[PDB]
Amino acid sequence: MPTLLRVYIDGPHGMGKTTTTQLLVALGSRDDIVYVPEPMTYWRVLGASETIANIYTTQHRLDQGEISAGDAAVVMTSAQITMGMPYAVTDAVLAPHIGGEAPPPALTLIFDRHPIAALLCYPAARYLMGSMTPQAVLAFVALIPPTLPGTNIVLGALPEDRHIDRLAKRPGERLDLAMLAAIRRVYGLLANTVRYLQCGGSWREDWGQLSGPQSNAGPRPHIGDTLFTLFRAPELLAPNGDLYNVFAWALDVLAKRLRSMHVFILDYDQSPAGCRDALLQLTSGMVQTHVTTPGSIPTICDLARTFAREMGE
Amino acid sequence: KMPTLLRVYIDGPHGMGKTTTTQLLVRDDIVYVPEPMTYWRVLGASETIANIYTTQHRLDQGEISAGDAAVVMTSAQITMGMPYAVTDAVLAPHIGGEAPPPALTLIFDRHPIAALLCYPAARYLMGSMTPQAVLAFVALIPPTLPGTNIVLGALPEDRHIDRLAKRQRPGERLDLAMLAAIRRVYGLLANTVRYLQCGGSWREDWGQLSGPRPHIGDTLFTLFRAPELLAPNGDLYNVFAWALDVLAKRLRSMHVFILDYDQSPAGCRDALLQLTSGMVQTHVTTPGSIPTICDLARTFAREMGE
Numbered sequence: 001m002p003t004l005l006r007v008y009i010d011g012p013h014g015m016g017k018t019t020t021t022q023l024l025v026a027l028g029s030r031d032d033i034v035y036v037p038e039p040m041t042y043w044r045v046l047g048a049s050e051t052i053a054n055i056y057t058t059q060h061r062l063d064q065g066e067i068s069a070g071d072a073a074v075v076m077t078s079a080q081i082t083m084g085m086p087y088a089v090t091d092a093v094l095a096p097h098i099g100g101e102a103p104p105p106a107l108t109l110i111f112d113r114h115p116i117a118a119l120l121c122y123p124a125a126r127y128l129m130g131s132m133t134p135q136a137v138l139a140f141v142a143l144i145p146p147t148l149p150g151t152n153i154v155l156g157a158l159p160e161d162r163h164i165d166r167l168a169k170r171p172g173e174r175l176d177l178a179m180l181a182a183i184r185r186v187y188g189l190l191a192n193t194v195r196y197l198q199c200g201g202s203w204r205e206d207w208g209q210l211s212g213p214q215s216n217a218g219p220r221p222h223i224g225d226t227l228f229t230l231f232r233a234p235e236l237l238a239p240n241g242d243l244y245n246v247f248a249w250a251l252d253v254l255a256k257r258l259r260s261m262h263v264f265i266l267d268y269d270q271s272p273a274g275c276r277d278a279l280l281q282l283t284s285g286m287v288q289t290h291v292t293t294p295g296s297i298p299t300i301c302d303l304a305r306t307f308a309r310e311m312g313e
Numbered sequence: 314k315m316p317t318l319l320r321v322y323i324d325g326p327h328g329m330g331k332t333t334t335t336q337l338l339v340r341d342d343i344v345y346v347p348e349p350m351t352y353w354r355v356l357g358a359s360e361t362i363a364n365i366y367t368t369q370h371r372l373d374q375g376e377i378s379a380g381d382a383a384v385v386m387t388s389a390q391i392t393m394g395m396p397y398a399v400t401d402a403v404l405a406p407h408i409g410g411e412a413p414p415p416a417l418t419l420i421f422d423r424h425p426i427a428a429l430l431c432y433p434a435a436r437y438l439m440g441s442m443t444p445q446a447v448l449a450f451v452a453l454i455p456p457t458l459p460g461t462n463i464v465l466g467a468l469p470e471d472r473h474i475d476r477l478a479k480r481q482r483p484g485e486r487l488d489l490a491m492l493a494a495i496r497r498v499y500g501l502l503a504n505t506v507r508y509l510q511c512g513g514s515w516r517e518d519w520g521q522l523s524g525p526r527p528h529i530g531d532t533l534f535t536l537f538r539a540p541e542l543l544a545p546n547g548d549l550y551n552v553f554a555w556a557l558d559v560l561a562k563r564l565r566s567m568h569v570f571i572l573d574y575d576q577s578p579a580g581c582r583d584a585l586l587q588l589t590s591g592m593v594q595t596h597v598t599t600p601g602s603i604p605t606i607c608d609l610a611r612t613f614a615r616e617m618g619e
């Protein structure tokens with residue numbers, strides 16, 4: 001069978017993810033590699049009207065005390081649903097074509113973000129910003145699609161000071177450093193969570209230890225430095241002080257989805273050509289998969305180009 | 314060979330009798346997974362059912378916009394579906410291939426598609442959810458595992474009105490339009506499964522909407538000839554067409570069984586038992602899967618059942 005390499009570039013906004021992705025794709029001959037962009041057109045038009053603008057405006061009205069947490073939550077939850085839809089459909093239509101983990105790839109697919117960005121990371125950050133309930137975050141977690149083989153996720157490293165400057169320059173967006181801190185924190189926790197699970201970590205065994213860096217290598221993190229720490233909140237706790245079982249089961253799903261992921265860390269604290277070449281070096285250690293039919297390769301190619309055409313800027 | 318499992322999802326429009334009939338149907342090699350009322354009223358959010366019906370009522374009276382109602386309905390639907398989604402996700406790895414004596418029978422009050430497809434679709438028909446949000450929920454419907462037996466109800470409308478009148482849940486308001494919308498959706502659901510199983514292809518038949526199996530106009534696909542979903546030239550945007558491809562994938566491998574509710578509670582129970590002989594069983598994946606499934610089921614029941 002021919003092989004496929006899927007690479008999801010993810011992490012907080014404003015790091016240079018999208019530029020880096022385009023540069024890497026520009027290296028390949030036209031169809032040895034395809035780009036799957038942020039579905040900006042879906043967010044701004046097809047899915048709803050100006051969803052990004054809606055998100056930042058809602059947070060700002062919450063902060064200013066012009067709306068309640070509950071009103072902010074229903075708007076945020078509904079908008080996060082819209083944000084994630086194209087990621088969910090894409091994953092769903094790709095799924096049957098993906099075979100077992102497997103000599104250059106017949107096809108390389110570079111994604112701008114994985115489904116977990118809209119289904120986990122952004123909701124979790126909004127929870128920290130007080131604009132989503134943790135119960136709602138856990139409903140999104142429960143709906144994270146089964147993690148396909150050869151799911152290579154590239155997350156970003158970048159000093160906060162540089163990141164802030166970068167954001168202050170390079171939508172419907174408003175400048176919110178608090179949200180930036182939360183989303184940086186959330187993606188840091190995510191990297192640690194995958195590494196914790198790969199090192200044999202069991203959240204149920206470590207839950208009692210709760211009371212309040214790079215990845216795919218290094219020692220096992222403390223549970224308090226993983227995403228599990230966010231979910232010890234009064235809303236989720238039964239009178240006896242344990243998590244309600246329904247929420248505990250959502251954490252089980254979280255562990256199952258993240259544990260089979262292949263995380264790599266890319267240093268964004270450099271020029272665009274630098275990030276590209278750094279990303280190119282990283283791909284050597286990334287996991288390829290087989291496809292399930294011979295004509296899966298052109299089918300996948302067409303899906304990606306159709307998607308890009310319809311929804312990328 | 315691993316022991317066998319029978320999963321039975323009792324679904325369909327609410328207020329037909331689904332929660333009493335199965336209450337009767339139970340007691341060791343059979344577990345009843347009741348509707349997660351406690352999650353709906355307390356754990357997930359405060360009185361989600363009241364929230365839903367109040368919002369539709371306010372929209373009807375023109376006290377809020379279509380827009381305000383949709384964001385409210387959308388997030389509320391997220392809360393409604395959550396226990397159904399976690400349960401499916403934690404059960405999924407335990408489910409083996411198709412497979413006689415079942416080691417364990419799981420009777421669920423509703424399948425994930427109630428909250429991820431049918432109720433959202435009905436609210437779309439009620440003007441209180443956008444069709445793009447409906448297709449977002451559809452895109453997240455978990456893959457259809459082997460042995461997915463879904464029981465849907467049959468009941469004439471007037472009899473259903475009578476039943477519903479006595480089966481109002483906390484916060485529910487009696488709404489004949491919602492009753493009609495939800496009955497229509499489940500009727501379309503049954504048709505859609507049959508359309509798909511008999512080889513229907515929505516992309517091939519899509520042209521027929523704009524003028525041996527059901528006509529596409531009598532399936533769930535007809536709902537998504539919504540103008541929000543269409544480019545200026547009338548074509549579905551691909552992203553929406555893909556959600557329809559997913560909808561088709563999910564439904565065609567479901568096994569649908571019809572339970573006539575127009576009879577006594579014990580008659581309904583007997584009818585459900587009669588239906589089981591056609592249902593498809595699966596093996597589990599590990600020896601300990603059965604006890605684990607049993608624990609999940611009983612814990613769900615205890616913590617979230619009313």
Ligand SMILES: C#Cc1cn([C@@H]2O[C@H](CO)[C@@H](O)[C@@H]2F)c(=O)[nH]c1=O
Binds near residue numbers: 083
């Ligand atoms: C995917 C994604 C998401 C992107 N975003 C935002 O979209 C913008 C562009 O990525 C940026 O301001 C931020 F990343 C969300 O607020 N939520 C999401 O789920």
Ligand SMILES: C#Cc1cn([C@@H]2O[C@H](CO)[C@@H](O)[C@@H]2F)c(=O)[nH]c1=O
Binds near residue numbers: 393428429482
């Ligand atoms: C599952 C489920 C759902 C149930 N409901 C409602 O909850 C009650 C189910 O017993 C009933 O009033 C109605 F069916 C929804 O409004 N949406 C759903 O998704």
